[PDB]
Structure 1
Amino acid sequence: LEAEMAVERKAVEDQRDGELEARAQKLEADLAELEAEGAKADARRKVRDGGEREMRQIRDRAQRELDRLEDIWSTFTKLAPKQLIVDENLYRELVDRY
């Protein structure tokens, strides 16, 4: 169970890396084209800020998923009789995963 949890964690990490690389490549290409066009750096900052916000948002979602898996594994490892799940959404996720 730990092994299958690890590999799927790598899979979600891999797709996250692919998305970040693609977005970063697009941001870098846009900046390079804008630099070649000799802009006043106002549009360079605007594009850079827009990309940075996108990078933060993607990483924010990635960590949301990462901690969701961490909570799932932690609950499973310490799962003891008479323990209570406050939220039904967590329980359905826990049973669906395992």
Structure 2
Amino acid sequence: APVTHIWYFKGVPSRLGYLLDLAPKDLEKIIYFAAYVITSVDEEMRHNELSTLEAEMAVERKAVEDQRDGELEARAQKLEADLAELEAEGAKADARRKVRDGGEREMRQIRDRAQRELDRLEDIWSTFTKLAPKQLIVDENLYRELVDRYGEYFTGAMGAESIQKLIENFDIDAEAESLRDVIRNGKGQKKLRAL
């Protein structure tokens, strides 16, 4: 398996960071298998697929609401079960009215998973619409969701095998011209860092 030379990674400054424009902490995470990194993403297939994917996500959220309404009606019946002897019988009101707070927790329960799935789908779609090369994705769950739903349209890995791809897919001329442009007409810490 490919490895990296220690001299060009743990140096001051980190001469491998200046080349890929990454912070040394990110290199420390990626190289020793503690974070994922995407290397390339083709934008055309993503571009002409937005409508279908968002429609499918809307269908998935409708699937959530399908369970939502039934859960709401079941909760209503469960609360009516306790309400059957609430203000009409001789049962002490303490527990028979704290079951109302229990039912507040119950009605929040279904909306909990509902909002969980809503947020899940929203963040997945937003991340898939924001992906750019050299972005770190910790917490595998997100990466699994991305590689299952949007399995194509991007590539990402972990370790020195991905650093190799990042170095290979680097255009010296374009970066050099951009940096020279910045140092030519620029002001602030940007000029110092580009120099």
Q: TM-score, normalised by structure 1?
A: 0.81
Secondary structure of 2:134's match?
coil
Tell me how far apart the structure 2 counterparts of residues 23 and 81 of structure 1 sit (CA, whole Å). Answer: 47
How far the C-alpha of 1:56 sits from its partner, in A, is: 1.8
Secondary structure of 2:92's match?
coil
How far the C-alpha of 1:53 sits from its partner, in A, is: 1.3
Q: Deviations over 1:44-76 (max 9, x none)?
A: 312211111122233222212211111101011
Q: Deviations over 1:6-28 (max 9, x none)?
A: 01111112202211221122202
Q: TM-score, normalised by structure 2?
A: 0.45
Tell me how far apart the structure 1 counterparts of residues 138 and 94 of structure 2 sit (CA, whole Å). Answer: 50
| Maintained 8 Å contact 1:16/1:62 | yes
Does 36-45 or 46-55 show the bigger shift?
36-45
Secondary structure of 2:84's match?
helix
Secondary structure of 1:15's match?
helix
Structure 1 segments (4+ residues) deviating >6 Å: none
| Maintained 8 Å contact 2:86/2:97 | no
Give the alignment of 1:69-84 within 5 angstroms.
Answer: 69-84=121-136
Tell me how far apart the structure 1 counterparts of residues 78 and 87 of structure 2 sit (CA, whole Å). Answer: 14
| Maintained 8 Å contact 1:85/1:91 | yes
| Maintained 8 Å contact 1:31/1:47 | no
Q: Which has the higher helix share?
A: 1
Give the alignment of 1:19-58 within 5 angstroms.
Answer: 19-58=71-110
Match of 1:67 in 2: 119
Tell me how far apart the structure 2 counterparts of residues 62 and 38 of structure 1 sit (CA, whole Å). Answer: 37
Structure of larger gyration radius: 2
> What's the % identity of the aligned pairs?
100
Structure with the bigger RCO (C-alpha within 8 Å, sep 6+) is 2
Does 66-75 or 81-90 show the bigger shift?
81-90
Q: Can you give the 5+ residue segments of structure 2 that lack an aligned partner in the other structure?
A: 1-52, 150-195
Q: Can you give the 5+ residue segments of structure 1 that lack an aligned partner in the other structure?
A: none
Tell me how far apart the structure 2 counterparts of residues 75 and 10 of structure 1 sit (CA, whole Å). Answer: 21
How many residues matched? 97
Q: Which has the higher strand share?
A: 2
How far the C-alpha of 1:38 sits from its partner, in A, is: 4.5
Tell me how far apart the structure 2 counterparts of residues 26 and 69 of structure 1 sit (CA, whole Å). Answer: 30
| Maintained 8 Å contact 2:137/2:143 | yes
**RMSD across aligned positions (CA):** 1.9
